[PDB]
Amino acid sequence: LKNAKEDAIAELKKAGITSDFYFNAXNKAKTVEEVNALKNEILKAHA
């Protein structure tokens, strides 16, 4: 549930954008849906 934030962070930071984290979408994302959406946004933004 709330661990979705951490999972998304770790996922993209370790095996998504090589080594990135710096947007605040990580903090703003409260609910799972937001985490997934904002993760997609970060992922597409960095491509």
DSSP calls for 1-47: -TTHHHHHHHHHHHHTSSS---SSHHHH--SHHHHHHHHHHHHHHH-
Measured distance CA(44)–CA(47) in Å, rounded = 5
Measured distance CA(20)–CA(31) in Å, rounded = 21
Stated length of the chain: 47
Domains and CATH numbers, the chain: 4-46 (1.10.8.40)
**In which residue are the tokens 């990135």 written?**
20
**Token reading at 47:** 């491509």
Say which amino acid occupies 40. N
Burial 6-44 (b: 16+ CB within 10 A, else e): eebbeebbeebeeeeeeeebbeebeeeeebeebbeebee
Selection from 39, 38, 44, 32 nearest residue 12 by Cα = 39
**Experiment type:** NMR
Measured distance CA(38)–CA(29) in Å, rounded = 7
